[PDB]
Amino acid sequence: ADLATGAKVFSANCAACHAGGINLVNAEKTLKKEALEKFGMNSIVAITTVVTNGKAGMPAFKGRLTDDQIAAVAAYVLDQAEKGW
Numbered sequence: 563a564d565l566a567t568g569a570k571v572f573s574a575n576c577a578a579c580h581a582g583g584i585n586l587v588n589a590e591k592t593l594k595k596e597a598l599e600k601f602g603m604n605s606i607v608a609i610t611t612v613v614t615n616g617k618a619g620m621p622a623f624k625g626r627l628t629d630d631q632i633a634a635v636a637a638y639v640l641d642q643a644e645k646g647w
């Protein structure tokens with residue numbers, strides 16, 4: 563919502579591990595709505611925090627993405643998950 567920036571950020575930073583509906587190394591490790599919901603991750607604040615910091619080995623993007631870029635990709639992930647990738 564910046565979805566335009568979000569889509570670009572996703573392509574350049576996230577698709578390498580999450581690309582095209584299902585993740586390359588995963589099944590429910592994709593960004594499907596139901597998977598996000600299990601751990602309360604289906605919100606702008608939750609995705610912003612995990613991408614910035616993130617968690618449990620998932621890489622932190624605080625160095626290489628600005629706060630605005632992270633907010634943008636968070637929007638993109640939520641919108642795509644709602645549409646169904």
Ligand code: HEC
Pocket residue numbers: 571572575576577578579580585588590591592593598601603609612613620621623635636639
């Ligand atoms: C590999 C080196 C990754 C890159 C680059 C990105 N992510 Fe990731 N992510 C990765 C793994 C192994 C996992 C756990 C399994 C799974 O895929 O669910 C995740 C998880 C997420 C999640 C869910 C977090 C949760 O608490 O369950 C989100 C929302 C997520 N990943 C988003 C995301 C974005 C927006 C990225 C680019 C900025 C990104 N990931 C990069 C591995 C990797």
